[PDB]
Design a protein around this ligand. Structure first.
Ligand SMILES: [Mg+2]
Length: 100
C-alpha cells in the first residue's frame, strides 16, 4: 500500500489529471448518471486510501482502472477529456507495472 500512495500522488499531480480530480457533476454533464453506473475519481480513491479502506493493491488498481474505463465509456477518444484520460491510463499502467 505504500506504492498505492506513491502512484496516487503522482496521478493527482499529473498535468493530465484535471478531469479526474473530483467526482463528475451529473447536474452539469448531461447523460452521465444514465451512462456511468459506478463513478470513480482520484478524490474518492484518496478518501478511501486515507480512511484505511483498501485491503490489497488489487482493489486499489481496480478503482484506478475504473476511472479510465468510465472515461472511455463516456468521452470520445478525440475529446479533450478522452485525450487526457488516455495519457493518464497509460501513465498508471506504466508505473503500476514497473513496480509489480
Ligand atoms: Mg481493463
Amino acid at each position: 500500500l505504500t506504492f498505492c500512495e506513491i502512484i496516487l500522488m503522482e496521478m493527482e499531480s499529473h498535468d493530465a489529471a484535471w478531469p479526474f480530480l473530483e467526482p463528475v457533476n451529473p447536474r452539469l454533464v448531461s447523460g452521465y448518471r444514465r451512462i456511468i453506473k459506478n463513478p470513480m475519481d482520484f478524490s474518492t480513491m484518496r478518501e478511501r486510501l486515507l480512511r484505511g479502506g483498501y485491503t490489497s493493491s488489487e482493489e486499489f488498481a481496480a478503482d484506478a482502472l475504473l476511472v479510465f474505463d468510465n472515461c472511455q465509456t463516456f468521452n470520445e477518444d478525440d475529446s479533450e477529456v478522452g485525450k487526457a484520460g488516455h495519457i493518464m491510463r497509460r501513465f498508471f499502467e506504466s508505473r503500476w507495472e514497473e513496480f509489480y
